Design a protein around this ligand. Structure first.
Ligand code: NA
Ligand code: NA
Length: 327
DNA sequence: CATTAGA
DNA sequence: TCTAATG
């Protein structure tokens, strides 16, 4: 957790590198497992040889561990950190819609920067166009004070469209959090479940409501169940307009909502931890359901849930406020 | 780990 | 269809 901190960071760094810049999944997975195991190891690694004793730790990684052990740095690390091309990629990549593949392709063409990008909008597809367009707004956190303003907006349309809708803003937002990355709205309707073969307008009506009042201003990806776009609070009585925010609205089979909402609500640790518990308490949990665990090894059969409670009761735990779903 | 775009 | 990208 700190006793191995550098070896781990160098490692993640290293790793990250083969992945983006080069296309070396292997080496790249190589670093992460290594990174994974040393992170655990209960002692201060004093040498490559010692490290080497671990699993996932080959000769190649030990070597690097020495140099970093000996001199507060690593050459290769130094070299990459420097190198413009590689730097360009980790950079382009910050654009929503840009990832390793397009990043290298752009660079190999010469677009290394934000400007370049603009000069070449035509070489960019609508997602990226927008990523570019709101590049600034996209990196800016979401003040909770703002979230509450938003949510207040969405719940209101949802309801006005159909009283039957059920929406829940998930995430850290939900877990009390001060700021937030982007808004996650979990959506559902009675008339829609595991079987009841869709109702695409079900999603589409809201998306359309939301736009009709200008909360959504853009569409990244709209499909029959997941809609990925952009929204913005009204810029009041001018002098101050609100930055553009990322929003994801998703349709849910009313019969799997709470597993959904339980889940997206995180945290990542609370999950696994709750998840690790159902297992003792003879179960299984995942994004949509909760099935009783059969001794033959496995076993099916989706218990029925009507609230985040059911799930608790089921595995028989303490109802944990989202607030405290921290770990 | 699954959903959408794109070409 | 494959492949990329966000989640
Ligand atoms: Na070994
Ligand atoms: Na990106």
């Amino acid at each position: 957790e700190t006793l191995n901190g550098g070896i781990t960071d160098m490692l993640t760094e290293l790793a990250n590198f083969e992945k983006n810049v080069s296309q070396a999944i292997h080496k790249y997975n190589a670093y992460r497992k290594a990174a994974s195991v040393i992170a655990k190891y209960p002692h201060k690694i004093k040498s490559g040889a010692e490290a080497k004793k671990l699993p996932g730790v080959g000769t190649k990684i030990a070597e690097k561990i020495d140099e970093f052990l000996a001199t507060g740095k690593l050459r290769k690390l130094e070299k990459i950190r420097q190198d413009d091309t590689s730097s360009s990629i980790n950079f382009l990549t910050r654009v929503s819609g840009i990832g390793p593949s397009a990043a290298r392709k752009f660079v190999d063409e010469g677009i290394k920067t934000l400007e370049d990008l603009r000069k070449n909008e035509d070489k960019l597809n609508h997602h990226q166009r927008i990523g570019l367009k709101y590049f600034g707004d996209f990196e800016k956190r979401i003040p909770r004070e703002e979230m509450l303003q938003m949510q207040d907006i969405v719940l209101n349309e949802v309801k006005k469209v159909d009283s039957e809708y059920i929406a829940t803003v998930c995430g850290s937002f939900r877990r009390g959090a001060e700021s937030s990355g982007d808004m996650d709205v979990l959506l559902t309707h009675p008339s829609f479940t595991s079987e009841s073969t869709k109702q695409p307008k079900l999603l589409h009506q809201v998306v359309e409501q939301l736009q009709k009042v200008h909360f959504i201003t853009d569409t990244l990806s709209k499909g029959e169940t997941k809609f990925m776009g952009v929204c913005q609070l009204p810029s009041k009585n001018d002098e101050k307009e609100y930055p553009h925010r990322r929003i994801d609205i998703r349709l849910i089979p009313k019969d799997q909502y709470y597993c959904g909402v339980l889940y997206f609500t995180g945290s990542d640790i609370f999950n696994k931890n709750m998840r690790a518990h159902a297992l003792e308490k003879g179960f299984t949990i995942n994004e949509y359901t909760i099935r009783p665990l059969g001794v033959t090894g496995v076993a099916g059969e989706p218990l029925p849930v009507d609230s985040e409670k059911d799930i608790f009761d089921y595995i028989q735990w303490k109802y944990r406020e989202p607030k405290d779903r921290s770990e």
